[PDB]
């Protein structure tokens, strides 16, 4: 029993964290094979960062300008290139600790673990979801740039995020490992504001199923709803629309708990209009939206990595 | 900026997880140097669960009764001993991945990361606190026994917990890495119930300071209180008494935020009095008690 916000074991990712220094700037890098990946703003001064020409700043760089440190050992850079907002530093040594990995771009609502690092050294690991507005509600201080977000599939690390910046509201913005920003963000000190956030409905439903599995049933009700009626209510409360794909994905949990997806939707519908009434679900007084259906199944079935 | 429940990177601990099998029972073990540590109930049968005699069951065992598996490689056990509720299996190979480590016993309110494993393989990592009643509110299925709780304070892994059992209320009981149970629990299937749990007050105050640091101030007030008046209110909500030591510990946060400890105590008094009024502190609608003053300073 028990339900926790659980991150993937970070070991395979820790073995890839290096410190990248370019001039006065020091952030983290991801060392996979003979390439180190890091945000391209490492080649930026506070003068440059207002309106930076990265293609121009990078042509003025030589391989020795990048100090790459893997532990106490300093790696030598033999090539430098840029793909979108990520810098790629070709190195002379392949990382012996390189795991089976792949670069994946995630969709909103999807969750991942973050391995927060400072000076190429991992300091913490936490779980978070890609918000529907494309920001992550992370925990990042100065120097955390280059920290990566990942998921583990069997024995394969799927790298899906690299941290670049923090918005004025305390939320964070980053890119996939191909340098493509998540959302409408740019990698420069400019006026940028996250759009109005919405609740990830399929995850709230997955989390209600996890609560039922752990014996919390007070919120269950005799009612069911149509997918259309639920969505009309969901919009009114700033909840993401629930598609037929979300209903299909929630299928195994529906079968394991004997509570049809549209039956759980009517429980969620009552919770939104009426509230908790001083009660909690899984020790929480709010509807949690940071557990995907595959997360709930993985935690309640004991899938190992 | 930002405030999350953050676990320590589990890498150093993953490299120590092995599968220990004794007859029909299979749980996890912690392989440090040439010793594998695991709960002593791996040597119990169906008949030996209500009142097993472990000293007697262990003398009837031989090294070749313990199947220790590190990855696909099967380790050879060359000695077996018991220290309190933990079994120590001396092996012929030292773990190449053994980190700088130390065994520490924690006190209620202290937090640590748990590396949940099944069949010697890490499935997940999460953060939790040692409850004032000495149980942990973990996430554990059958086979997670031997999973360890730890804190990585600069390069060194402090092992402070090993999972042993699940109480009838869904909460968990375990020991330090010296086999000493946390609380009044025994490693028998006899009727055991956790005492009524209480909120870790110093942790709620530390968490309110973290919220102020991150710009959340709606809960603040013009009031201050005596430490005695605060404690009388606290017990009425099942909150742990706040000692002078807790006030001292909250000193750096009080200085960083310019909000005296007894001033925050009056904010907490008011929060207990009215509740949240549909508002949240750090994205939560309840007062979080699984962040210590040390975690709040570290994370911020
Ligand atoms: C369905 O069985 C479970 C489910 C979740 C579980 C989560 N953590 C641990 C489990 N095991 C136990 O607590 C064993 C089962 C029998 O009762 C005792 C009594 C004493 C001792 Cl030391 C161990 C145990 C779990 C066993």
- The Cβ of residue A197 has, within 10 Å, a number of other Cβ atoms equal to 15
- A5 plus A119 within the same structural domain: yes
Give the integer Cα–Cα distance in Å for B275 and B269.
10
Domain boundary among A197, A228, A245: A197
**Rounded distance from Cα B210 to ligand 1 centre (Å):** 36
- B68 plus B6 within the same structural domain: no
CATH number at A240 reads: 1.10.1840.10
- B113 plus B193 within the same structural domain: yes
Burial class (CB in 10 A: 0-12, 13-18, 19+), A276: middle
Closest to A281 measured CA to CA, from A230, A205, A227: A205
- B129 plus B222 within the same structural domain: no
- B5 plus B107 within the same structural domain: yes
- A181 plus A214 within the same structural domain: no
Angle A55-A57-A58 from CA coordinates, rounded to 5°: 65
How does A42-64 read in b/e, with b if 16+ C-beta sit within 10 Å? bbbeeebeeebebeebeeeeeee
Helix or strand (DSSP H, E) at B273: helix B261-274
Q: How many residues does chain A have?
A: 305
Interface test with B, best of A7, A129, A157, A284 (most B CBs within 10 A): A7
Domain boundary among A144, A165, A197: A197
Give the integer Cα–Cα distance in Å for B79 and B88.
8
Bridge partners of A164? none
Domain boundary among A143, A173, A197: A197
Three-class SS of residue B235? helix
- A290 plus A206 within the same structural domain: yes
Nearest-Cα distance to chain A for B166, in Å, is: 8
Structurally, chain B folds into a number of domains equal to 3
CATH number at A90 reads: 2.40.10.10
From residue B44, alpha-carbon distances to B22, B23, B75 in Å are: 9, 9, 21
Surface of B (143-182) touching A: CB under 8 A: 143-144, 166, 170-172
- A9 plus A129 within the same structural domain: yes
- A181 plus A35 within the same structural domain: no
Q: Within 13 A of B205's CA, how many CA atoms are on the CB side? A: 30
Give the integer Cα–Cα distance in Å for A297 and A254.
11
Find the domain containing A293 and state its range.
198-301
Residues 6+ apart with CB under 8 A from A232: none
Q: How was it solved?
A: X-ray
Pocket of ligand 1 (CB under 6 A): B 41, 140-142, 144-145, 164-166, 172, 187-189
Q: Give the closest of A122, A123, A139 to B4, CB-based.
A: A139
Give the integer Cα–Cα distance in Å for A133 and A154.
29
Residues 6+ apart with CB under 8 A from B174: B136, B149, B161, B162, B163, B164, B165, B181, B182
- A203 plus A283 within the same structural domain: yes
B285 interfacial to chain A (CB closer than 8 Å): yes
H-type helices in B145-243, by residue range? 201-213, 227-236
- B162 plus B280 within the same structural domain: no
- B75 plus B122 within the same structural domain: no
Helix or strand (DSSP H, E) at B35: strand B35-39
């Amino acid at each position: 029993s028990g339900f926790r916000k659980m991150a993937f074991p970070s070991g395979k990712v820790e073995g890839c964290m290096v410190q990248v220094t370019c001039g006065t700037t020091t952030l983290n890098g991801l060392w996979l094979d003979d390439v180190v990946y890091c945000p391209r703003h490492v080649i930026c001064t506070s003068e440059d960062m207002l309106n930076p020409n990265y293609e121009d700043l990078l042509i003025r760089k030589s391989n020795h300008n990048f100090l790459v440190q893997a532990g106490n050992v300093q790696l030598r850079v033999i090539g430098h290139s840029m793909q979108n907002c990520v810098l790629k530093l070709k190195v002379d040594t392949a990382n012996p600790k390189t795991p089976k990995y792949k670069f994946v771009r995630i969709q909103p609502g999807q969750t991942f673990s973050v391995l927060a690092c400072y000076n190429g050294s991992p300091s913490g690991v936490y779980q978070c979801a890609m918000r529907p507005n494309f920001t992550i509600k992370g925990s990042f201080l100065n120097g955390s740039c280059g920290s990566v977000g990942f998921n583990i599939d069997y024995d394969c690390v799927s790298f899906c995020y690299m941290h670049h910046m923090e918005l004025p509201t305390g939320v964070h913005a980053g890119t996939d490992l191909e340098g493509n920003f998540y959302g409408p963000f740019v990698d420069r000190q400019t006026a940028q504001a996250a759009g109005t956030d919405t609740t990830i409905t399929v995850n709230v439903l997955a989390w209600l199923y996890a609560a039922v599995i752990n014996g919390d049933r007070w919120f269950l009700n005799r009612f069911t709803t149509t997918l259309n009626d639920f969505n009309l209510v969901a919009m009114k409360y700033n909840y993401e629309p629930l598609t037929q794909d979300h209903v299909d994905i929630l299928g195994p949990l529906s079968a394991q708990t004997g509570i049809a997806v549209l039956d759980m939707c009517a429980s969620l519908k009552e919770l939104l209009q009426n509230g908790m009434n001083g009660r909690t679900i899984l020790g929480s007084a709010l509807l949690e939206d940071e557990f995907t259906p595959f997360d709930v199944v993985r935690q309640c079935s004991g899938v190992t990595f």
